[PDB]
Amino acid sequence: DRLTVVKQYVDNVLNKASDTYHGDKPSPLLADGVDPRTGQQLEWIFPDGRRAVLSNFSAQQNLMRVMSGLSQLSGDPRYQKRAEDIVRYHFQNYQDPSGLLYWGGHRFVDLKTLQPEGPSEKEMVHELKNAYPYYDLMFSVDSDATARFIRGFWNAHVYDWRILETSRHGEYGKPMGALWESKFEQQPPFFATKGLSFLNAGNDLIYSASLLYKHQQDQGALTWAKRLADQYVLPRDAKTGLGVYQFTQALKREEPTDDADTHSKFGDRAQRQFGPEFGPTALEGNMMLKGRTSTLYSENALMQLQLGKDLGPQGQDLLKWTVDGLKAFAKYAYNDQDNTFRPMIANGQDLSNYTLPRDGYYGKKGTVLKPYKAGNEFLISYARAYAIDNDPLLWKVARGIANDQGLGDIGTAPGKEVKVNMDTTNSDPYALFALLDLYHASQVADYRKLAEKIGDNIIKIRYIDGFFMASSDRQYADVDAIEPYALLALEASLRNKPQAVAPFLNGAGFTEGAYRMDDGSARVSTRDNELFLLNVGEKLQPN
211 shares a domain with 165: yes
Q: CATH number of the domain at 100, please.
A: 1.50.10.20
Last residue of a domain, one of 327, 352, 371: 371
Q: CATH number of the domain at 47, please.
A: 2.30.30.880
Q: CATH number of the domain at 274, please.
A: 3.90.105.40
136 shares a domain with 217: yes
437 shares a domain with 315: yes
User: Tell me, what DSSP letter sits at residue 101?
Assistant: B
User: Tell me, what DSSP letter sits at residue 141?
Assistant: H
299 shares a domain with 199: yes
70 shares a domain with 195: yes
Domain-embedded: residue 302: yes
* Torsion region of 241: left, alpha or beta (phi above 0 gives left; psi -120 to 50 gives alpha): left
Q: Which residues touch 38 (CB under 8 Å, ≥6 apart)?
A: none
Contact by Cβ (8 Å): 96, 173: yes
210 shares a domain with 220: yes
Domain-embedded: residue 542: no
345-375 burial code (b ≥16 CB/10 A, e <16): bbbbbebbebebeebbbbeeeeeebebbebb
Identity of the residue numbered 393 = L
440 shares a domain with 327: yes
Backbone angles phi, psi at 489, to 5 degrees: -60, -40
Handedness of CA 215, 217, 218, 223 (dihedral sign): positive
Domain-embedded: residue 201: yes
**527 lies in which domain range?**
43-55+108-121+511-536
Specify the number of domains making up the chain.
Answer: 3
Q: Looking only at Cα atoms, what is the longest distance across the chain?
A: 65
267 shares a domain with 201: no
97 shares a domain with 137: yes
Domain-embedded: residue 196: yes
Domain-embedded: residue 299: yes
Domain-embedded: residue 541: no
Domain-embedded: residue 412: yes
Handedness of CA 349, 350, 355, 361 (dihedral sign): positive
Integer Cα distance of 439 and 463 in angstroms: 25
Integer Cα distance of 242 and 334 in angstroms: 13
58-94 burial code (b ≥16 CB/10 A, e <16): bbbbbbbbbbbbbbbbbeeeebbebbbebbebbbeeb
Domain-embedded: residue 543: no
420 shares a domain with 307: yes
426 shares a domain with 333: yes
Enclosing H/E stretch for 311: helix 301-311
518-541 burial code (b ≥16 CB/10 A, e <16): eeeeebeebbbebbbeeeeeeeee
DSSP letter string over 8-22? HHHHHHHHHTB--SS
Resolution in A: 1.5
237 shares a domain with 218: yes
Contact by Cβ (8 Å): 394, 376: no
Integer Cα distance of 360 and 354 in angstroms: 14
